[PDB]
Design a binder for this molecule. Structure first.
Ligand SMILES: CCCCCCCCCCCCCCCCCC(=O)OC[C@H](COP(=O)(O)OCCN)OC(=O)CCCCCCCCCCCCCCCCC
Ligand SMILES: CCCCCCCCCCCCCCCCCC(=O)OC[C@H](COP(=O)(O)OCCN)OC(=O)CCCCCCCCCCCCCCCCC
Ligand SMILES: CCCCCCCCCCCCCCCCCC(=O)OC[C@H](COP(=O)(O)OCCN)OC(=O)CCCCCCCCCCCCCCCCC
Ligand SMILES: CCCCCCCCCCCCCCCCCC(=O)OC[C@H](COP(=O)(O)OCCN)OC(=O)CCCCCCCCCCCCCCCCC
Ligand SMILES: CCCCCCCCCCCCCCCCCC(=O)OC[C@H](COP(=O)(O)OCCN)OC(=O)CCCCCCCCCCCCCCCCC
Ligand SMILES: CCCCCCCCCCCCCCCCCC(=O)OC[C@H](COP(=O)(O)OCCN)OC(=O)CCCCCCCCCCCCCCCCC
Ligand SMILES: CCCCCCCCCCCCCCCCCCCC
Lengths: 601, 504
C-alpha cells in the first residue's frame, strides 16, 4: 500500500504542469502529461488494490500531516483506505483514465487543450481527496474541489455566455448544498468534538443517550449536502443545465466524480444514519421521488444530453433509494455499474455530436444505424444496461440487488416506485434510441462496452466489513422479483418499439392533445423547479441588488454633511456686511445674556 | 529593543526616499525597497527568536518583547511598545505588504516620487506603531498618524482618470470618518484615564495599569462604545463603511496605496487588544448588537459587491463582508473563533492584496474600470485572467486557500457559541460565491463588449508576475499548513480569551 498520497499527487502534478504550460506545449505532450498523470494514478490504484487484497482486507491509514490544531479542535490531514474507499477510488481513477484517453482523441484541434486536461486532472485529484479522506473536513476540501472543477469544466467554452451562466448555476446550487454540509460539520463537532468518521460513530451512541435531536439535525444536513452534490431533490436543477460543457466533462461529472459524491457521503456516514432511522427513510423517499420525476422529465427531452442528464438523475435516485432501504452494497454496486455504462453512453453521444454537426434535435436526426454502426452498438449496449435488460447487462443485477434490498426491509412503496422507474427508464432510453437511430473501434469505448455487459457484474466491491450486509430475501420471493423486473423492462422495450419506431401517429396524437401539451411542457422544464427557484431566489436577489445599487447606508451617513452645509449657508446670512445689523446683533446678544442671567440666577 | 527600530526604520527610510531623489528619479524606489526589506527582515528575526510556538498563556500582561521610554511625564505618557504573537503576525504582514507596495509602485518614476515613497513609508510606520503601542495615547497617536499621508496619497497621487475633485472628495470623506472616530476614541481614553485617577490617584495611559479599573456598567458601556465606534469606522462596520469604496476607487492606480494603508486591519486587532480586555462586561453585553452588525455587514457587502460595475469597488465591498465575519468572530468567547479570525485577517490581507494588484495591472493594460466595457479577456491576456481566477477563488472561500481556514474556524467557534448567526453567515458564504463568479463572468469570460477588450494586451512582466505568484504560494501554504500561524498567535489569543471569559 502506502501510495494513496501518490494517487492524489500525480493528478495534482499534472494539473500544475498543464496550467503553468498555458498552451505553450504541443497537443501530444500535453495529452501524454494529462492522461499519463491519470493513468499512473489508475496504475497505483491497481497496485494498492492488489496489496489490499493480499492482506486480510484490513483498513489502512496514511496520516500525511496535521491540518489544524486549536485546543480540542484537531483536524488531521490523513487518508484512509477500506473496501468502500478502494471501490470509489478504483472507479474514479479507471473511468477517469478511460475518459481522459477519449478526450485525448476528442479534444484535438480545440483551444485550451492543456487547460482542459489541467482542469480534469484537478477534478481527479479533488475526487480522490474526497473519497480517501478520514475526516469530514478533508472530505469538505475534496467536496469544494470537485465543485470548483465542475464550474471550471462546465463553462469551458467561455465565449458563449450560456455556458458561463450554466456553470455559475451549478456552482451556486452546489454551494448551497455545501453550506448544508457545513452545518452538518458544525453540529457534529459541537456535539462530539471530532470529525473523524470512526471516532464519530464510536462516540455518538454514548453522547446521544438522552437526546437525539442534534444527531437528527446533523444527519439531515449531511443529506442536504449529499443531495446538493448528487443533484437530487431539492437541489437538482443544475444537472440538466450543466450540459453546456463538452462530453468528456459530462461523462466525468455524471459517471465518475460529481453525482456519485452524495452516495459516498451517505455510505461513509452510515453509522450516524442508522441511529436516525427517520432521516435514512427520508433519504430513501428523496431518492424515490427524484428518480420518478427524472424519469418523467427524461421522456419529453428533445436532446441526447438532456435525456442522459435526467437518466443520471434517476439512477442516482436509485442509489439513494438503496441507501434509504439499508441496501448499501446494492448502492455501491449500482454506483460502479452506472459509472461504466453512463460513461459509455456519454462518450457515444459525444461521438454522435462529432459525427453530426450543430447539436441537432433528436427529431432532425434519424436512421443513423447504417452510417455509424459501432456508435449505434455502443448506444444499444448502454441503453440496455440503463434499461436493465436481464442476464446480459450489469445494470440488471444492480437494480435487482437494489429492489431486493427494498423488498427485504419491508419497503413496499419504494419497491413499486423503483419498478415504475425501471419501466419508464426503458421507455425513455429506447425512445431516444429509436428516434435518433431509426427512420473507429477506440479502446475506451470497447472497454466500457465490455464492462457494461455482465462482465461488469462479475466485479464485486469488497464491502464486507465496511458496510453492513443487507438482509437476505427468500429464494422464491427474490425469484419472482427477478421475473417481475425482467418483464417490466421487456414490456418497456416493447412499448418503446411500438410507440416511436414507425409512423409515430399515437405519440403525435398524445403530444398534440391539450393535457398532453400541458404535461409535456411541465415535464420538459423539470417540473417547474427552475421556474420556482428563479422566482423565489434569483428575482428577489437581483431586485435587492438593484434597490441597493446606490448605497443607502452611505447616504444616511452622508446626511450629516448635508445638514452641515445647510446650517452653514443659513448662518452665513447673518454676515450681510451691514454695520447697523452688527450693532443690532450685539444688542440682541446683550438682551439674551442678561435675560439668561436673570432667569438662571 | 528592536520595536523602536521596527517603527523608526520606515520613518528614516521615508526621509531618505525624499532626500535621495536629487541623485536620481529612479533612486527613491530603491531606498524604499531596502527599508521595507529591513523592516520585514527584522520582523522575521523577531519571529525566529521569539519562540512563539512554545510559549504558554499566562494572562495579560504577557509580552514577548517590550520597550519603555517616558514621553509626556506630566500625564504619565510614555513611548511604550510591546510585542506578542498577534502583534508579531500583524507586523510581519504589514512588512510583507509594504514590500509588495514598493514593488507595485515600481516603473512609476516622475518628479516628487520620493514624496510618494515618504508618504508610503510613514503610513507603514504608523501601522506598525498601532500594532506595537501598548499605552493608549501612543496607540491613538499612531492611529491618527497614518491618515495624513493617506489623505495626501489619495488626493494628490490618486486615480489620474478622475476629475481631480472626486479624489479630494474621497480623501476628505475618509479623513473625516477616521479622525472623528479617533476623536471619540480619545474621549473614551481620557475618561478611562480619569476614572483610573479617581480610583487610585496616579496618572497612567499604560494599558496594563488601566486593566481592572473599577467602574460602573453604564460608564464601562460608554467607554466601550467610544472604542467600538473608532474601530467600526476603520474595520469597516456598517453603516460606517461608506469611506472605503470611494477611497479605494480614488486611490493611486497601482494599488500599492491600498496595500499600504487601506487594506490592513488595525481595527480588528484594536478590538481584540483594547476592547475585550479593557471592557469585558461591556463587550459581553454589546456582543449581540456587534454580531448582528457583522451579519448585516456580510450580506450588505455581498449585495453591494454584486451590484458594482467597478472592480475596485467590488473588492472593497468584499473586504466589508469578510470583516463582518471577523466582527462576528471577535465577540464570541471562543478560542477557536479567535484563531480563525487571526487566520482570516492574514488571508484576507493576502487575497485582497492580490486582487487589488491584479486590478491595477488590468487597468494599466485596458485603461478602463467598467466591467461592461470588457469581456472575454481570457483569450487576450497571457497570465492575468488565470491569476485573477485564482484570487477570486480564494476570496470565494475555497479550501486550499487560507480564507477557507479562517472562515471555517470562525464558524466552528461561533456555532459553539451562537448557532443562528453562524447559519446566516454561512449563507453569507453562498453570497460570496455569487459575487466572485459574477466578477469573473463580467470581466474575463464571454465576448468583448468594446474595442479595447478585442485587442491583444501585453503580458505581465517578471516583477509583477513574481509578486503575484508569491502571494499565490503564501495563500496556498496558509490553506494547507496554517499551523505555524496558529502556534504563533495561540498564547496571545488564549490570554485575550481567558481575560474576556473569566471577568464575566
Ligand atoms: C489539492 C488537491 C485537490 C483538493 C481541492 C483543492 C481546491 C482548490 C484548488 C485551487 C487551485 C486553483 C484553481 C483556480 C485557478 C485556476 C487557474 C487556471 O485556470 O490555470 C490555467 C491557466 C492556463 O490556461 P490557458 O488558457 O492555457 O492559458 C492562459 C491564457 N493563455 O494557467 C495559467 O495561466 C498559469 C497558472 C495560473 C495559476 C494556477 C493555479 C495556482 C494555484 C495552484 C498552484 C500554486 C503554486 C504551487 C505551490 C503551492 C505551495 C507549495
Ligand atoms: C490535498 C491534496 C493532498 C495533499 C498533498 C498536496 C497538498 C498541497 C501541496 C502544496 C502545499 C503543501 C503544504 C503542506 C506541506 C507539508 C506539511 C508539513 O511539513 O507537515 C509536517 C509533517 C511532519 O510530520 P508530523 O510530525 O506528522 O507533523 C504533523 C504536522 N503538524 O510533514 C510530513 O509529514 C510530510 C508529509 C509529506 C507531504 C508531501 C506533500 C507533497 C505535495 C506535492 C504537491 C504538488 C502540487 C502543488 C500544488 C497543488 C495544488 C494547490
Ligand atoms: C424553497 C425550498 C427549497 C430551497 C433549496 C435551496 C435553495 C436552492 C437555490 C437554487 C437556485 C439558485 C440559482 C442560481 C443561479 C445562478 C446563475 C444565474 O442565473 O446567473 C445570473 C446572474 C448573473 O450575474 P450577472 O453578472 O449580473 O449577469 C451577466 C449576464 N446575465 O446571477 C444572478 O442572478 C445571481 C443569483 C444569486 C442567487 C442567490 C441564491 C441564494 C440561495 C439561498 C438558499 C437558502 C436556502 C434555505 C432557505 C430557508 C429554508 C427554511
Ligand atoms: C429533503 C432533502 C434535504 C434538504 C436539505 C435539508 C433540510 C434543510 C431544512 C432547513 C433549511 C436550512 C437551515 C438549516 C438550519 C439548521 C439549524 C441548526 O442546526 O440549529 C442547531 C441549533 C442548536 O441549538 P441548541 O444546542 O438546541 O440550543 C439550545 C440549548 N440546548 O438549533 C437552534 O438553535 C434552533 C434554531 C436554529 C436556527 C434556525 C434558523 C436559522 C436561520 C435560517 C436562515 C436561512 C436563510 C438565510 C437567508 C439569508 C439572507 C438572504
Ligand atoms: C402500479 C402502477 C403501474 C404503472 C402505472 C402507470 C405509471 C405511469 C406510466 C407513464 C407512461 C405510460 C406510457 C405511455 C405514455 C408515455 C409515452 C408517450 O406516448 O409519450 C408521448 C408524449 C411524449 O413524446 P414526444 O417525444 O414528445 O412525442 C414525439 C413527437 N411526435 O407524451 C406526452 O407528451 C405526455 C404523455 C402523458 C401520458 C400520461 C401520463 C400519466 C401520469 C400523469 C402524472 C401527472 C403528475 C402527477 C399527478 C398530479 C396531480 C394530478
Ligand atoms: C451637525 C449635526 C450632526 C452631528 C451631531 C449629531 C449628534 C452627536 C452626538 C451623538 C451622541 C449623543 C450622546 C450619546 C451618549 C449619551 C450618554 C447618556 O445618556 O448616558 C446616560 C447613562 C450614564 O450612565 P450612568 O447611569 O451614569 O451609569 C452609572 C449607573 N448606571 O448611560 C447609560 O447608563 C448607558 C447608556 C448606553 C447607551 C447610550 C449611548 C447610545 C449611542 C448610540 C450610537 C451608537 C450605537 C451603537 C454602535 C453603532 C455602530 C458603530
Ligand atoms: C498509463 C497507464 C495506464 C494504466 C491503466 C490501468 C487501468 C486499466 C484501464 C481502465 C480500466 C477501468 C476499470 C475499472 C474497474 C473498477 C473495479 C472496482 C472494484 C472494486
Amino acid at each position: 500500500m502506502n501510495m494513496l498520497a501518490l494517487t492524489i499527487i500525480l493528478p495534482l502534478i499534472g494539473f500544475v504542469l498543464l496550467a503553468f504550460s498555458r498552451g505553450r506545449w504541443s497537443e501530444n505532450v500535453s495529452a501524454i502529461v494529462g492522461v499519463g498523470s491519470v493513468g499512473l494514478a489508475a496504475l497505483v490504484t491497481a497496485f494498492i488494490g492488489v496489496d489490499f487484497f493480499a492482506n486480510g482486507e484490513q483498513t489502512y491509514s496514511q496520516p500525511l500531516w496535521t491540518w489544524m490544531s486549536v485546543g480540542d479542535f484537531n483536524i488531521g490531514f490523513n487518508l484512509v483506505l477500506d473496501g468502500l474507499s478502494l471501490t470509489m477510488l478504483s472507479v474514479v481513477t479507471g473511468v477517469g483514465f478511460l475518459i481522459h484517453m477519449y478526450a485525448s482523441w476528442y479534444m484535438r484541434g480545440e483551444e485550451g487543450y492543456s487547460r482542459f486536461f489541467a482542469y480534469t486532472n484537478l477534478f481527479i485529484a479533488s475526487m480522490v481527496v474526497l473519497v480517501l479522506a478520514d475526516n469530514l473536513l478533508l472530505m469538505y476540501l475534496g467536496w469544494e474541489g470537485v465543485g470548483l472543477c465542475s464550474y471550471l469544466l462546465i463553462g469551458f467554452y467561455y465565449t458563449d455566455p450560456k455556458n458561463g451562466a450554466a456553470a455559475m448555476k451549478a456552482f451556486v446550487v452546489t454551494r448551497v448544498g455545501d453550506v448544508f454540509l457545513a452545518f452538518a460539520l458544525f453540529i457534529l463537532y459541537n456535539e462530539l468534538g471530532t470529525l473523524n468518521f470512526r471516532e464519530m460513530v464510536e462516540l455518538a451512541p454514548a453522547h446521544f443517550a438522552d437526546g437525539n435531536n442534534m444527531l437528527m439535525w446533523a444527519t439531515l444536513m449531511l443529506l442536504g449536502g449529499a443531495v446538493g452534490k448528487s443533484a437530487q431533490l431539492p437541489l437538482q436543477t443544475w444537472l440538466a443545465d450543466a450540459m453546456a460543457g463538452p462530453t468528456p466533462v459530462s461523462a466525468l461529472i455524471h459517471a465518475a466524480t460529481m453525482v456519485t459524491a452524495g452516495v459516498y457521503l451517505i455510505a461513509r456516514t452510515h453509522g450516524l444514519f442508522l441511529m436516525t432511522p427517520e432521516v435514512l427513510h427520508l433519504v430513501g423517499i428523496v431518492g424515490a421521488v427524484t428518480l420518478l420525476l427524472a424519469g418523467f422529465a427524461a421522456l419529453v427531452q428533445t436532446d441526447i444530453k438532456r435525456v442522459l442528464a435526467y437518466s443520471t438523475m434517476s439512477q442516482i435516485g436509485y442509489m439513494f433509494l438503496a441507501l434509504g432501504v439499508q441496501a448499501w452494497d446494492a448502492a455501491i454496486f449500482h454506483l460502479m455499474t452506472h459509472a461504466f455504462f453512463k460513461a459509455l453512453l456519454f462518450l457515444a453521444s459525444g461521438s454522435v455530436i462529432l459525427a453530426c454537426h450543430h447539436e441537432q434535435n433528436i427529431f432532425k436526426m434519424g436512421g443513423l444505424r447504417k452510417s455509424i454502426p459501432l456508435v449505434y452498438l455502443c448506444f444499444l449496449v448502454g441503453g440496455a444496461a440503463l434499461s436493465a435488460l436481464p442476464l446480459v447487462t450489469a445494470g440488471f443485477f444492480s437494480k435487482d440487488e437494489i429492489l431486493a434490498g427494498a423488498m427485504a426491509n419491508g419497503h413496499i412503496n419504494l419497491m413499486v416506485a423503483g419498478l415504475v422507474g425501471a419501466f419508464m427508464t426503458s421507455l425513455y432510453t429506447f425512445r431516444m434510441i429509436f428516434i435518433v437511430f431509426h427512420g473507429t473501434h477506440s479502446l475506451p469505448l470497447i472497454v466500457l462496452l465490455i464492462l457494461s455487459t455482465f462482465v461488469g457484474a462479475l466485479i464485486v466491491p469488497p464491502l464486507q466489513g465496511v458496510l453492513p450486509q443487507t438482509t437476505e430475501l427468500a429464494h422464491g420471493s427474490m425469484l419472482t422479483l427477478e421475473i417481475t423486473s425482467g418483464v417490466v423492462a421487456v414490456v418497456g422495450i416493447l412499448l418503446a418499439a411500438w410507440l416511436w419506431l414507425g409512423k409515430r401517429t399515437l405519440v403525435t396524437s398524445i403530444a398534440n392533445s391539450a393535457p398532453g401539451r400541458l404535461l409535456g411542457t411541465w415535464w420538459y422544464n423539470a417540473w417547474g423547479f427552475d421556474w420556482l427557484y428563479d422566482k423565489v431566489f434569483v428575482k428577489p436577489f437581483l431586485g435587492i441588488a438593484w434597490l441597493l445599487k446606490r448605497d443607502p447606508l452611505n447616504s444616511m451617513m452622508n446626511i450629516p454633511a448635508v445638514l452641515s452645509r445647510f446650517a452653514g449657508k443659513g448662518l452665513l446670512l447673518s454676515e450681510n456686511g451691514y454695520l447697523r445689523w452688527y450693532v443690532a446683533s450685539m444688542s440682541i446678544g446683550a438682551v439674551v445674556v442678561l435675560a439668561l442671567l436673570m432667569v438662571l440666577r | 529593543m528592536l520595536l523602536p527600530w521596527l517603527i523608526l526604520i520606515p520613518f528614516i527610510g521615508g526621509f531618505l526616499c525624499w532626500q535621495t531623489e536629487r541623485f536620481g528619479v529612479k533612486v527613491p524606489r530603491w531606498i524604499a525597497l531596502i527599508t521595507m526589506g529591513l523592516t520585514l527582515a527584522l520582523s522575521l528575526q523577531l519571529w525566529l527568536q521569539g519562540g512563539y510556538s512554545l510559549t504558554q498563556s499566562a494572562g495579560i500582561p504577557q509580552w514577548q518583547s517590550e520597550f519603555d521610554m517616558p514621553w509626556i511625564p506630566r500625564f504619565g505618557i510614555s513611548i511604550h511598545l510591546a510585542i506578542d504573537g498577534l502583534s508579531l503576525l500583524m507586523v510581519v504582514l504589514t512588512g510583507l505588504l509594504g514590500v509588495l507596495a514598493v514593488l507595485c509602485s515600481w516603473k512609476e518614476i516622475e518628479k516628487y516620487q520620493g514624496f510618494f515613497h515618504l508618504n508610503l513609508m510613514w503610513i507603514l510606520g504608523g501601522v506598525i506603531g498601532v500594532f506595537l503601542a501598548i499605552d493608549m495615547f501612543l496607540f491613538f497617536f499612531f492611529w491618527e498618524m497614518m491618515l495624513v499621508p493617506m489623505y495626501f496619497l489619495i488626493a494628490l497621487w490618486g486615480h489620474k482618470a478622475s476629475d481631480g475633485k472626486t479624489r479630494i472628495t474621497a480623501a476628505t470623506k475618509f479623513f473625516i470618518y477616521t479622525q472623528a472616530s479617533g476623536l471619540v476614541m480619545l474621549i473614551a481614553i481620557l475618561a478611562l484615564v480619569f476614572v483610573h485617577y479617581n480610583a487610585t490617584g496616579v496618572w497612567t495611559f499604560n494599558y496594563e495599569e488601566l486593566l481592572n479599573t473599577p467602574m460602573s456598567s453604564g460608564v464601562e458601556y460608554l467607554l466601550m462604545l467610544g472604542f467600538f465606534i473608532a474601530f467600526a469606522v476603520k474595520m469597516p462596520v456598517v453603516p460606517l463603511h461608506g469611506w472605503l469604496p470611494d477611497a479605494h476607487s480614488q486611490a493611486p492606480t497601482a494599488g500599492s496605496v491600498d496595500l499600504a494603508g487601506i487594506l490592513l486591519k488595525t481595527a480588528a486587532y484594536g478590538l481584540l487588544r483594547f476592547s475585550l480586555p479593557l471592557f469585558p462586561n461591556a463587550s459581553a453585553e454589546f456582543a449581540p448588537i456587534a454580531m448582528w452588525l457583522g451579519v448585516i455587514g456580510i450580506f450588505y457587502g455581498a449585495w453591494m459587491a454584486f451590484a458594482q460595475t467597478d472592480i475596485k469597488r467590488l473588492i472593497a465591498y468584499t473586504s466589508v463582508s469578510h470583516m463582518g465575519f471577523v466582527l462576528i468572530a471577535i465577540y464570541t468567547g471562543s478560542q477557536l473563533a479567535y484563531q480563525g479570525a487571526v487566520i482570516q485577517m492574514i488571508a484576507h490581507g493576502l487575497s485582497a492584496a492580490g486582487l487589488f494588484i491584479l486590478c491595477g495591472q488590468l487597468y494599466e493594460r485596458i485603461h478602463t474600470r467598467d466591467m461592461r466595457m470588457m469581456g472575454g479577456l481570457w483569450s487576450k491576456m497571457k497570465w492575468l485572467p488565470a491569476l485573477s481566477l485564482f484570487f477570486a477563488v480564494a476570496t470565494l472561500g475555497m479550501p486550499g486557500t487560507g480564507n477557507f481556514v479562517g472562515e471555517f474556524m470562525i464558524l466552528f467557534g461561533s456555532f459553539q457559541v451562537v448557532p443562528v448567526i453562524t447559519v446566516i453567515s454561512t449563507f453569507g458564504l453562498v453570497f460570496a460565491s455569487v459575487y466572485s463568479l459574477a466578477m469573473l463572468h463580467r470581466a474575463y469570460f464571454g465576448k468583448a463588449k468594446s474595442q479595447i477588450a478585442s485587442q491583444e494586451l501585453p503580458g505581465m512582466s517578471l516583477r509583477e508576475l513574481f509578486m503575484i505568484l508569491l502571494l499565490v504560494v503564501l495563500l496556498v501554504l496558509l490553506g494547507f499548513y496554517p499551523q505555524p500561524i496558529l502556534d504563533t498567535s495561540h498564547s496571545a489569543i488564549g490570554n485575550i480569551q481567558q481575560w474576556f471569559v473569566n471577568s464575566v
